[PDB]
Amino acid sequence: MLKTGVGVIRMWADEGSRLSRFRMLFTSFVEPPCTSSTFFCHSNMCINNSLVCNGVQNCAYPWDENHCKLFEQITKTHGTIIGVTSGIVLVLLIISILVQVKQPRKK
Amino acid sequence: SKEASALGVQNIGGIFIVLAAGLVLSVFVAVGEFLYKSKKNA
């Protein structure tokens, strides 16, 4: 927690440049009291200016960008596709059936 | 405790195949019997 508003990051290397990395992320607005415009991720952590669900886990607790939020049956891998091909077959069948529903008689 | 799943085509697929085989065999035997009776009359 940077108490102030000025940041200081240093790395000292000594013929060891094969060091994996230093890689971090800093998030602002820990100070601001919460208002309607900003967002309450966690204790004294309303940080929102555009930060709401920006693709980065940018809050101490996972609330700021974490899980913000009939057509299902049609969305089958190919069961719907084979089903509708069979449906076309069955429409052909019904239309054929009506012909001899009305066509033949006794003898 | 994991046995809560609806049956699907991955669990019931052979019956439709059997039905199709039955239908094609029905058509074959139907035309065969039609020619049988027509030939016997002829």
Binding site: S86, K107 | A4, V18, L19, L23, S26, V29, E33
Partner: protein
């Protein structure tokens, strides 16, 4: 409608249509099916079949529904297709009943947690406590085996689930599955001042 996946049902309906229509088209072309109508028939010439579109369709529907029908298939083709359809319907219904019984008798024998040790055996529900608030330390210095494995899970997660303040853990349990081992009196004060939260165990 649950026990069968929402893929077979359309398969079943379209197969019913197809089987019924195949039955109808065969029954309208057969050298055996045409029948002399009169109850006391002295060799007249008014023969016909009995299969219309509606008749075959509702024969298929009834057979799928296991309540029977009115038609009696006569020729080899109609009887063989009827038999295959009956076999299909019988196994479909039996599988449906078996799966519904499976759901009910696998749900009925679920055991919701009611004690610390039964919780310890379970794994999915992550644990927690307000850290170093003299509560987790009890697990830290404990000697009992079950509490030792509790603390082992605690240390395995290690700030994945170890909340720092009461109310944050309260909201965590509200919006997730959690245990949040904390002292009794505050649990009373919260459970009786809210709902959805149950004092579990002793």
């Amino acid at each position: 409608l649950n026990p069968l996946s929402p893929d077979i049902w359309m398969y079943v309906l379209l197969a019913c249509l197809g089987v019924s229509c195949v039955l109808f088209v065969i029954a309208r072309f057969s050298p055996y099916e045409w029948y002399n109508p009169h109850p006391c028939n002295p060799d007249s010439d008014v023969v016909e079949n009995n299969f219309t579109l509606l008749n075959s369709f509702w024969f298929g529907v009834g057979a799928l529904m296991q309540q029977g029908s009115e038609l009696m298939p006569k020729a080899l083709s109609t009887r063989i297709v009827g038999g295959i359809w009956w076999f299909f319907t019988l196994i479909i219904i039996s599988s449906y009943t078996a799966n519904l019984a499976a759901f009910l008798t696998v749900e009925r024998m679920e055991s919701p947690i009611d004690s610390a040790d039964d919780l310890a055996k379970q794994t999915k529900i992550e644990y927690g406590a307000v850290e170093d608030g003299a509560t987790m330390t009890f697990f830290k210095k404990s000697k009992i085996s079950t509490y030792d494995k509790m603390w082992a899970f605690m240390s395995s997660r290690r700030q994945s689930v170890l909340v720092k303040s009461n109310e944050e853990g309260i909201q965590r349990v509200l919006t997730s599955d959690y245990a949040f081992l904390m002292e009794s009196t505050t649990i009373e004060f919260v459970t009786q001042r809210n709902c959805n939260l149950t004092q579990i165990g002793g």
